[PDB]
Amino acid sequence: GHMAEVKVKLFANLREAAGTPELPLSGEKVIDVLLSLTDKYPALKYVIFEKGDEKSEILILCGSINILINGNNIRHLEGLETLLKDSDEIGILPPVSGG
């Protein structure tokens, strides 16, 4: 139920593929926002998630990305289920020191 209104920020080549440094979006959890980002920017659908389960709607966050919530890093929180809010914010970043 509901979709909390949030913001999303991109960085490095992720900003290049979204064509914007940031944009508004919504979702009740982190993943519900991520899944809308890839919806209009398919150029990030396989840069934020793994190109697997190509016969279902199961997806997996990439193993090289870093996701944030107001900067709090979901990697230290509930993960894809950190439960966003009507004024929360997210940041998506690529890997570093490798690729």
Short mmCIF file of C-alpha atoms in Angstrom, two decimals:
data_model
loop_
_atom_site.label_atom_id
_atom_site.label_comp_id
_atom_site.label_asym_id
_atom_site.label_seq_id
_atom_site.Cartn_x
_atom_site.Cartn_y
_atom_site.Cartn_z
CA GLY A 1 0.00 0.00 0.00
CA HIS A 2 1.06 3.59 -0.82
CA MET A 3 4.34 4.72 -2.42
CA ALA A 4 6.35 7.13 -0.28
CA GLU A 5 7.47 10.17 -2.27
CA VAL A 6 11.26 10.46 -2.34
CA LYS A 7 14.22 11.70 -4.37
CA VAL A 8 16.96 9.80 -6.22
CA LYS A 9 20.49 11.00 -6.97
CA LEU A 10 22.85 9.48 -9.55
CA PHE A 11 26.63 9.84 -9.75
CA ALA A 12 29.39 9.21 -12.31
CA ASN A 13 28.25 7.29 -15.44
CA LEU A 14 24.86 6.66 -13.74
CA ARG A 15 24.07 10.39 -14.15
CA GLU A 16 25.04 10.08 -17.82
CA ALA A 17 22.58 7.27 -18.43
CA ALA A 18 19.72 8.96 -16.54
CA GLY A 19 20.52 12.22 -18.33
CA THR A 20 20.00 13.91 -14.92
CA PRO A 21 21.98 14.25 -11.66
CA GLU A 22 18.78 13.57 -9.68
CA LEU A 23 14.99 13.18 -9.97
CA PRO A 24 11.84 12.71 -7.83
CA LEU A 25 10.23 9.26 -7.52
CA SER A 26 8.15 7.14 -5.12
CA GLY A 27 8.13 3.75 -3.39
CA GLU A 28 7.23 2.27 0.01
CA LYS A 29 10.65 0.58 0.17
CA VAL A 30 14.06 1.19 -1.43
CA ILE A 31 13.40 -1.37 -4.18
CA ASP A 32 10.06 0.24 -5.11
CA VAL A 33 11.98 3.42 -6.00
CA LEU A 34 14.83 1.56 -7.74
CA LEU A 35 12.32 -0.31 -9.93
CA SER A 36 10.88 2.99 -11.21
CA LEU A 37 14.33 4.41 -11.93
CA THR A 38 15.07 1.48 -14.26
CA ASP A 39 11.54 1.78 -15.73
CA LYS A 40 12.20 4.97 -17.70
CA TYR A 41 15.99 4.56 -17.75
CA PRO A 42 16.48 1.02 -19.13
CA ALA A 43 20.12 2.08 -19.56
CA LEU A 44 20.36 1.52 -15.77
CA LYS A 45 18.14 -1.59 -15.50
CA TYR A 46 21.25 -3.76 -15.91
CA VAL A 47 23.58 -1.34 -14.10
CA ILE A 48 21.62 -1.39 -10.81
CA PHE A 49 20.32 -4.98 -11.11
CA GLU A 50 21.63 -8.33 -12.35
CA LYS A 51 20.43 -9.42 -15.82
CA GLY A 52 19.11 -12.73 -14.42
CA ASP A 53 15.73 -14.50 -14.07
CA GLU A 54 14.93 -13.32 -17.62
CA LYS A 55 11.74 -15.47 -17.48
CA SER A 56 10.19 -13.94 -14.34
CA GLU A 57 9.93 -10.69 -12.42
CA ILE A 58 12.46 -11.64 -9.77
CA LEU A 59 15.45 -9.25 -9.82
CA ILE A 60 18.69 -8.84 -7.84
CA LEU A 61 20.60 -5.67 -6.95
CA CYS A 62 23.99 -5.52 -8.70
CA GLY A 63 27.04 -6.79 -6.77
CA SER A 64 29.08 -3.66 -7.55
CA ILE A 65 26.67 -0.78 -6.76
CA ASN A 66 26.29 1.24 -3.58
CA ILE A 67 22.88 2.55 -2.54
CA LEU A 68 22.27 5.24 0.10
CA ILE A 69 19.32 6.68 2.03
CA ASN A 70 19.93 10.34 2.92
CA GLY A 71 23.57 9.08 2.90
CA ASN A 72 22.92 6.35 5.53
CA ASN A 73 23.95 3.51 3.11
CA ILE A 74 21.30 0.73 2.96
CA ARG A 75 24.32 -1.61 3.28
CA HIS A 76 24.17 -0.75 7.03
CA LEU A 77 20.35 -0.71 7.18
CA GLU A 78 17.48 -3.03 6.17
CA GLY A 79 18.86 -3.12 2.61
CA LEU A 80 16.26 -3.04 -0.21
CA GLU A 81 13.61 -2.79 2.57
CA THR A 82 14.87 0.29 4.51
CA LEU A 83 11.29 1.67 4.16
CA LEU A 84 11.47 5.09 2.45
CA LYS A 85 9.43 8.16 3.48
CA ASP A 86 7.53 11.05 1.89
CA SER A 87 10.69 13.18 1.90
CA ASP A 88 13.49 10.60 1.96
CA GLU A 89 16.31 10.52 -0.60
CA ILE A 90 18.44 7.86 -2.29
CA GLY A 91 21.83 7.85 -4.01
CA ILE A 92 23.13 5.25 -6.45
CA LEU A 93 26.87 4.86 -7.08
CA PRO A 94 29.06 2.57 -9.24
CA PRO A 95 32.00 0.45 -8.00
CA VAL A 96 35.44 1.95 -7.27
CA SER A 97 39.10 0.93 -7.57
CA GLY A 98 37.88 -1.67 -10.12
CA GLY A 99 35.12 -2.66 -12.56
#
